[PDB]
Design a protein around this ligand. Structure first.
Ligand SMILES: [Cl-]
Ligand SMILES: [Cl-]
Ligand SMILES: [Mg+2]
Ligand SMILES: [Mg+2]
Ligand SMILES: [Mg+2]
Ligand SMILES: [Mg+2]
Ligand code: NA
Length: 228
RNA sequence: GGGAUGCGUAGGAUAGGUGGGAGCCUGUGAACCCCCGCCUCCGGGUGGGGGGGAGGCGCCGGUGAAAUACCACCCUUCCC
């Protein structure tokens, strides 16, 4: 069969037609998290954009009220004194155009990459393909590039996450853990939704949030009302 | 509403996109063997049945632009 019996039991706990309020969803999440770890909770949205149009792309950040519920691993690529600054800002792995080969040799143990401007030429040319399409190439307007590297890293450690729509027009984020008490999950969800809406492209066709869902790392989904 | 389909090269080999994921599946019958339908890029994939009778898969590692389980929103091409 397509799923195991564990997953199949979860299918009886959700209505496929209902669009749930965010509070209902936040309360249901724990019933849909039956894997043997604390499952990340996710929000997904199909977006009223043409994704193949650069000017209707949706990229941005939000500081999650209660964060992801896990250690966030930041790779900072910097030069000279920015190396030390990155480090004292709690970045976990910090270096120069050196460690580009470390990423090119395929170490991908980071949840965010941030970089100073003076390294972005190398980062661009060498990690452009590996990180580009995924919106992971440090970028001045996902706020992952700057000389204020310490400031950028602190925001990330304090719960800031990035989102970028995919080439199909959907967008997705982790917004916490299913062990989060329901009001806290609901807090994170609303924050992500608010931020997603803050980057609605000027002039795109139709409703911006065509559909919105909450789901757990290995459970079924719950369609939600983003304005609840 | 259901189902199918997703293959440059390297790589176990058929890696659609992105996000999640450190575990997942398994007497609700694992590997492996065979039959049939469908699909096929001619490598195989996929669905069902039967045999078998207790493991297999993922992480890690390797290769790669991207990593396999598992889950989510989607997109491609079809079919009932
Ligand atoms: Cl700056
Ligand atoms: Cl919705
Ligand atoms: Mg995936
Ligand atoms: Mg990953
Ligand atoms: Mg499994
Ligand atoms: Mg038998
Ligand atoms: Na999921």
């Amino acid at each position: 069969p397509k799923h195991g019996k564990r997953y199949r039991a979860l299918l009886e706990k959700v209505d496929p037609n209902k669009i749930y309020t965010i509070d209902e969803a936040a309360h249901l999440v724990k019933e849909l998290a039956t894997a043997k770890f604390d499952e990340t909770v996710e929000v997904h949205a199909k977006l009223g954009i043409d994704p193949r149009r650069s000017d209707q792309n949706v990229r941005g950040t939000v500081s999650l009220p209660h964060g992801l519920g896990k250690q966030v691993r930041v790779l900072a690529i910097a030069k000279g004194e920015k190396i030390k600054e990155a480090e004292e800002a709690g970045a976990d792995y910090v270096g120069g155009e050196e460690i580009i080969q470390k990423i090119l040799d395929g170490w991908m143990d980071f949840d965010a990459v941030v970089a100073t401007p003076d390294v972005m030429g190398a980062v661009g040319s060498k990690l452009g393909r590996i990180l580009g399409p995924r919106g992971l190439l440090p970028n001045p307007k996902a706020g992952t590039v700057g000389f204020n590297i310490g400031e950028i890293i602190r925001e990330i450690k304090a719960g800031r996450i990035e989102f970028r729509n995919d080439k199909t027009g959907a967008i997705h984020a982790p917004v916490g853990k299913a062990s989060f008490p329901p009001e806290k999950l609901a807090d994170n969800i609303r924050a992500f939704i608010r931020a997603l809406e803050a980057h609605k492209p000027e002039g795109a066709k139709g409703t911006f949030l065509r559909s919105v869902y909450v789901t757990t790392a290995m459970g079924p989904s719950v369609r939600i009302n983003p304005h609840s």
